[PDB]
Ligand binder design. Structure first.
Ligand SMILES: [C]C1=C([C])[C]=C2C(=[C]1)N([C][C]([O])[C]([O])[C]([O])[C]OP([O])(=O)OP([O])(=O)O[C][C]1O[C](N3[C]=NC4=C3N=[C]N=C4[N])[C]([O])[C]1[O])C1=NC(=O)[N]C(=O)C1=N2[C]1[C][N][C](C([O])=O)S1
Ligand SMILES: NC(=O)c1ccc[n+]([C@@H]2O[C@H](COP(=O)([O-])OP(=O)(O)OC[C@H]3O[C@@H](n4cnc5c(N)ncnc54)[C@H](O)[C@@H]3O)[C@@H](O)[C@H]2O)c1
Ligand SMILES: [Mg+2]
Lengths: 1217, 107, 54
């Protein structure tokens, strides 16, 4: 048996001093990075004056020949609005998908120009965000396809065939000659002769990146290989400086290019790069490795090292490598490369760029809760870094070949004068992007200008392949801080453009301060609370320290005991085994007798006043202290979760982060709300699931505790050890032993706790079937006041994602792989049903199956493991029984092979099952099993019906670029957590408050602002909880009441209309590149069980004020109290003689004495389907208490998370520099 | 239609143009249910007409118009109310219903 | 353009023929000018050969 974590994440090679200095700078504070760069970038006053003069001269020439763009002239000629211009370019794009020129022209002349363009599976406007950048310079993340359709109809009906003709010719020019140098390498090489004769050179980019499958990587490989032949044939011995070369992206050459898969990268990717480099060597052309995301930088250095030390490549100086000056590690990376060039004797071609992925790096660091960014946050810092690194490169031209890739004339001029008077071809060069840089460098290349060479980075590919690179390009030119945007801005003077970034930074009061408008990840929530911190699993120091802490966690003797108020109790003891390897004993659990569980409830009851008397601020301080303890102990907590619950390190980090976030969120919500009149319920039984064994465990207990309730904590029988450690942490944080008792054991302990007479409330997260048993237990019970015992029951999902033909397959597949198979599908939020529009289903399914087979399944104490085990052999048997049933029905089943090592544990391979109809599913299958259905676009509304028809309502995803489809689907889906253009497993506390409806939950949502109010007898007013909107049917009912003479009830109805928070619509603070929305909706149809006329009027007012319809108990005999209702109200009112037939309901209001309430509660619990959140009151309570029925529980919370960076960049961050 | 607004000129020609900014991303939910019902009955041309009406309807348009500072001048498209339908044929009635339901109206 | 340039004279007629004050006569002429320019622009944004007159 392998020792735990003995092979967790060993580095590719021992880290040299130079490599370690790189890693040390990864997230260095910005104020520490800049001073050395300012020193390195300093030049003499004479040079700065000469540079400014050169830069002014370049900028004056640039602005002098600056003519209007072709699209701008087209917009002008036909008086097009922006939407018309965008719609026209979308139409032209589509017409160019028609290959035959004569066929296209007939369609234009005879069909398109004559009105109905719509007549002639894929929205015309799928790429409108890109064309929007071209036309307007601004990025709109999604497409208003109804606005574009209207604009296209309007412009065609107004201007006819001539404007279509001009649009097509424009689009043809741009997509064939401006965004790419050519469609094919042969075409690009032909078009390169003109500028080569003027002194330019070329580096061709075949536009591959981010392989998703093995087949993708093979395709990109043979594309590079075939391009190298064509370029090498064309080079014809010109060599690596005068002649053309190629650029490659490592992400194109392997589907798992990541530090987590470093062994696969070195074993499988490296030989492919070597083979391409050997061919480049034989033709003697340059081969450049493009720089990509920050978490790939250091990994790529291991390939660069091996290649430069490989004797088979000796004699060739064409190996090239990009370094990104916006990165804090850039100068240290250059030190490493220069030293490698010295050791290997290879004159490495070093392309210095600023960096292409800035927005994405900001979002990723925020999402991951890391200490700082790996890039600068002020644009001028990148400029100083660039010039500092150019000085380092220019001092090493004997050993490297510097290549200064920039379109900034100030940057260029500074380096031109820095390099001095001695020049020869091969000393260094400049570089520019095809299309973007020729105006500037025609003022540089040639003995009549600055007589310095420029290599053009030349994209090559079809219209289809060009999109990703294009948005990344167009977003760059649109940012306010970009040189290209500023030189075109008339309000920007040449003096401002030639301003020296080195001197500007040097004179700042605080050198190198972070941007004021970009939050560090820790500060995402500002003054409200401190964000939890994650760990960077791409950082070798982190991996090394985590390796030791994980190993140490595996040597600990973890135990879980019945921790009663009086001290640990005796019981039956057994071992806890690693689900991924039953030979790995993780610890020992002593489980609770039903006698001791009943005793613990009595002890909690006796201790309840002492805990309620701890002021809310001090209870919240305990939570905050507990959060600090968990943050400090995260590495050890990771190791325990990894081994006890079969989680990967990434998932365990998120798990501990979520626990920390619960603690801090409920602490802050407490400080915002709880006062003397919000009395605790009493002893609360917290029953938690195995699959989030720390986070949900902690969240329920922390909420109950901070609301002033003593807690009986019953963890899932599978995962008691992490629960015991969380209880130890909470107790260390100051929660008294009498306020928090741990009762390990199975459902018998849970049931004994629920049944205990003093149990005042139950918080349950788990399966719907178990919640239903607890609901039945509680229906026997009333509080001492004669009211139902509150139950929060957060249960299963049957979560769908709908994908239309506008979505990007690579994005979809990544989000599907994560949503369906992360944690082996053992997330309640996990994707269960993928719904694919028929026209794209085959392509996406092929890509999905290819991605499936790149997953590594195994024991999770290895960083390379993607998917761990299922929790037990019983879970495995249950999942496999489902798979084989489906397989028996003839459904296509895709499964990846499991290594023999999995036999010592309980594993189910990630599985894809292709279904015919959504009704082929019957129950939640809690494992790594994705079902796929196809749908025709016209049946989208029916498909949403089908998703809703399961009765679940937890998470839901939609991948589309089209606003009409977003509006349609999100208005018709009924689920508590929605996700647009991203995965569906985000439940960030306070950002996506988490929890569903129907069979998925009673609410209120964990991690949201209504949660604590359920755990006290009188609910406070949550922060931000109000609405200016009044339900109109409530208003009509209040008027009807006044017309009937029921004046007091009409007043109560109007008060309910005002007090309702129906229509609340908020955006919650969170990471950049995401919009996180929180809204209060009607729950649905509320069952009303009245006893008196006034009671019925109050119940109806409460239900209508919160947007609901009602079914009124016909056995009340109160039909005559509701005669002659307004039609608006009658539409919402039905009478029910058979409650079971008229559901599902979404809640209930009950009026009666205590035994009437108990009887109705039993009848309601017997209704099929969803657990109902029931509120009961006596007639006298209704008369005395306007809040007898609390409106908090008559609305439904909906969280929506929209990935606004999905189009390829972040519009908000484009204005930040 | 309103004088001084974008629907006005279209009343004075035999085929109305699409006015500037005249669109909506919202689809009437009753229109959607009607299209599905027509689908179920096999009235494929009418169901297509219903879907097309649902998309081209500008019901729900909600714009701020340019004007003076210190004012917000808003322009919105709502249902008219109850529309009198005088059909002659079943297909005609389905088409009338599609047009009226797509624009939020009762009939 | 003509109504704008002749607004003072048009004001005088409106004041005496229709009982308007100077301020309201100014508003009257401005609105006429705005109708003219608005329907002109709306025409430039929309009308094509298939939008036949009544
Ligand atoms: C020219 C070139 C070549 C030849 C090649 C390459 C490149 C380039 N790239 C790109 C770069 O990086 C950049 O992005 C551009 O170029 C731009 O820059 P320039 O011209 O310099 O401009 P300016 O304006 O001066 O600047 C801009 C910049 O800055 C920065 N920022 C912004 N904002 C900010 C910043 N920082 C800080 N903070 C703040 N706030 C940024 O950076 C921007 O951009 C590249 N890149 C990369 O990454 N890599 C590579 O490799 C490269 N190359 C190419 C290839 N790839 C790419 C793609 O694909 O896309 S391109
Ligand atoms: N809605 C959410 O937020 C959410 C979150 C996580 C998990 N879940 C659901 O949880 C399920 C998986 O977790 P699980 O396997 O641990 O759920 P489970 O229903 O099997 O058990 C959950 C807890 O209930 C206890 N239990 C079992 N029988 C009981 C009884 N008769 N009375 C009282 N307690 C009893 C168990 O000991 C455990 O502590 C999945 O259905 C998943 O969807 C929901
Ligand atoms: Mg269970």
């Amino acid at each position: 048996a392998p020792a735990p974590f003995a092979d967790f994440a060993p580095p590719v090679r021992p880290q040299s001093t130079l490599r370690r200095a790189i890693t040390a700078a990864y997230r260095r504070p910005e104020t520490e990075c800049l001073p050395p760069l300012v020193e390195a970038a300093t030049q003499s006053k004479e040079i700065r004056d000469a540079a400014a003069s050169t830069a002014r001269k370049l900028i004056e020439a640039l602005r002098g020949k600056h003519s209007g763009s072709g699209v701008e002239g087209l917009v002008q000629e036909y008086s097009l609005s922006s939407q018309e211009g965008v719609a026209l370019m979308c139409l032209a794009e589509a017409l160019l998908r028609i290959p035959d020129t004569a066929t296209r022209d007939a369609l234009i002349r005879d069909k398109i120009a004559d009105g109905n363009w719509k007549s002639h599976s894929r929205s015309l406007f799928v790429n409108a965000a890109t064309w929007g950048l071209v036309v307007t310079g601004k990025l709109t993340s999604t497409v208003n396809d109804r606005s574009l359709a209207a604009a296209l109809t309007r412009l065609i009906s107004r201007c006819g065939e001539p404007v279509i003709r001009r649009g097509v010719d424009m689009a043809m020019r741009m997509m064939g000659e401006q965004f790419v140098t050519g469609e094919t390498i042969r075409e690009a090489l032909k078009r390169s002769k003109e500028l080569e004769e003027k002194g330019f050179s070329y580096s061709y980019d075949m536009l591959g990146e981010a392989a998703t499958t093995a087949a993708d990587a093979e395709r990109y490989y043979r594309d590079y290989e075939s391009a190298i032949h064509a370029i090498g044939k064309a080079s014809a011995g010109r060599g690596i400086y005068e002649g053309p070369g190629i650029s490659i992206k490592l992400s194109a050459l392997h589907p798992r290019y990541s530090r987590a898969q470093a062994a696969r990268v070195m074993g499988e990717l490296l030989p492919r790069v070597k083979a391409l480099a050997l061919l480049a060597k034989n033709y003697d052309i340059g081969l450049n490795i493009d720089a990509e995301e920050a978490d790939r930088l250091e990994l790529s250095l291991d390939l660069l090292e091996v290649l430069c030390l490989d004797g088979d490549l000796s004699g060739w100086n064409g190996m090239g490598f990009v370094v990104q000056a916006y990165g804090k590690r850039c100068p240290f990376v250059l030190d490493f490369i220069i030293d490698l060039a010295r050791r290997s004797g290879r004159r490495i071609m070093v392309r210095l760029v600023k960096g292409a992925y800035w927005d994405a790096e900001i979002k990723r660091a925020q999402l991951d809760g890391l200490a700082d960014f790996p890039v600068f946050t002020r644009k001028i810092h990148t400029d100083v870094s660039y010039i500092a690194c150019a000085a380092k490169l220019l001092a090493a031209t004997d050993v490297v070949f510097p290549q200064f890739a920039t379109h900034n004339a100030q940057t260029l001029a500074a380096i031109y004068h820095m390099a001095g008077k001695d020049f020869h071809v091969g000393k260094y060069e400049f570089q520019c992007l095809h299309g973007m840089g020729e105006p500037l460098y025609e003022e540089v290349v040639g003995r009549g200008k600055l007589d310095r060479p420029c290599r053009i980075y030349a994209p090559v590919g079809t219209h289809e392949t060009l999109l990703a690179y294009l948005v990344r390009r167009l977003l760059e030119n649109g940012a306010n801080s970009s040189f290209v945007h500023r030189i075109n801005d008339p309000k920007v003077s040449i003096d401002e453009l030639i301003a020296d970034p080195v001197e500007v930074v040097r004179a700042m009061p605080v050198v190198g301060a972070k941007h004021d408008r970009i939050a560090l990840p820790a500060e995402l929530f500002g003054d409200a609370r401190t964000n939890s911190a994650g760990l960077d699993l791409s950082n070798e120091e982190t991996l090394a320290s985590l390796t030791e802490a994980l190993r140490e966690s595996a040597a600990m003797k973890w135990t879980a005991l019945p921790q009663l108020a009086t001290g640990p109790a005796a019981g039956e003891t057994r071992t806890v085994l690693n689900p991924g390897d039953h030979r790995d004993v993780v610890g020992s659990v002593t489980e609770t007798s039903e006698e001791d569980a009943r005793r613990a409830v009595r002890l909690a009851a006796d201790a309840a006043p002492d805990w309620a008397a701890v002021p809310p601020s001090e209870r919240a301080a305990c939570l905050d202290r507990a959060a600090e303890l968990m943050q400090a102990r995260m590495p050890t907590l990771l190791g325990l979760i990894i081994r006890e619950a079969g989680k990967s390190a990434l998932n365990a980090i998120a798990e501990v982060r979520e626990a920390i976030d619960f603690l801090r969120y409920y602490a802050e919500q407490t400080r915002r709300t709880l006062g003397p009149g919000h009395g605790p319920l009493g002893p609360i039984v917290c029953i938690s699931p195995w699959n989030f064994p720390l986070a949900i465990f902690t969240g329920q207990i922390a909420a109950a505790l901070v609301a002033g309730n003593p807690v009986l904590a019953k963890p899932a029988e599978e995962t008691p050890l992490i629960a015991a450690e969380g209880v130890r942490i909470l107790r260390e944080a100051g929660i008294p032993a009498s306020a928090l008792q741990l009762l390990p054991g199975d459902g018998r302990v849970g049931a004994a706790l629920v049944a205990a007479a003093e149990t005042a409330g139950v918080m349950f997260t788990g399966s719907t079937e178990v919640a239903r048993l607890i609901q039945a237990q509680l229906a026997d019970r009333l509080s001492p006041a004669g009211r139902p015992i509150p139950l929060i029951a957060e249960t299963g999902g049957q979560n769908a994602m709908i994908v239309d033909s506008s979505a990007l397959a690579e994005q979809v597949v990544g989000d599907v792989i994560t949503s369906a198979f992360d944690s082996a599908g053992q997330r309640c939020s996990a994707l269960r049903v993928l719904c694919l529009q028929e026209d794209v289903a085959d392509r996406i399914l092929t890509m999905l199956k290819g991605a499936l087979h790149e997953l590594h399944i195994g024991r999770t104490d290895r960083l390379s493991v993607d998917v761990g085990p299922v929790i037990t052999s019983e879970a495995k048997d249950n999942i496999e029984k489902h798979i084989e049933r489906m397989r028996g029905l003839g459904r296509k089943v895709e499964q990846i092979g499991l290594a023999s090592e999995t036999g010592v544990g309980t594993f189910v391979p990630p599985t894809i099952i292709e279904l015919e109809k959504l009704s082929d599913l019957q129950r939640e299958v809690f494992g790594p099993v994705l079902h796929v259905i196809r749908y025709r676009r016209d049946d989208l509304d029916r498909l949403v019906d089908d998703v809703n028809a399961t009765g679940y309502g937890l998470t839901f995803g939609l991948h589309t670029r089209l606003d009409e489809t977003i509006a349609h689907v999100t208005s018709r889906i009924k689920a508590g957590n929605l996700y647009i253009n991203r995965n569906i497993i985000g439940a960030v506390v306070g950002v996506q408050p988490f929890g569903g409806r129907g069979l998925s939950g009673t609410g209120p949502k964990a991690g949201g602002p209504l949660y604590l109010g359920r755990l006290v007898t009188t609910a406070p007013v949550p922060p931000q909880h109000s609405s200016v909107h009044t339900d109109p049917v409530l208003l009509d009912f209040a008027k009807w009441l006044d017309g009937k003479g029921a004046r007091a009830e009409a007043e109560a109805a109007r008060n309910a209309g005002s007090s309702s928070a129906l229509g609340l619509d908020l955006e919650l603070p969170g990471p950049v590149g995401e919009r996180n929305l929180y809204t209060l909706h009607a729950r649905g149809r509320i069952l009303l069980v009245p006893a008196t006329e006034s009671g019925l009027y109050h119940q109806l007012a409460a239900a209508l004020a919160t947007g609901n319809s009602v079914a009124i108990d016909a056995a009340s005999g109160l039909q005559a109290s509701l005669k002659n209702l307004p039609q608006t109200v009658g539409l919402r009112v039905s009478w029910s003689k058979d409650w079971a037939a008229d559901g599902p309901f979404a809640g209930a209001l009950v009026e009666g004495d205590a035994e009437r309430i108990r009887a109705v509660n039993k009848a309601i619990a017997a209704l099929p389907g969803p657990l109902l959140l029931v509120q009961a009151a006596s007639s006298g309570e209704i008369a005395r208490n306007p809040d007898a029925y609390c409106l908090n529980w008559l609305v439904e919370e909906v969280s929506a998370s929209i990935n606004t960076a999905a189009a390829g960049g972040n519009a908000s961050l484009m204005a930040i520099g």
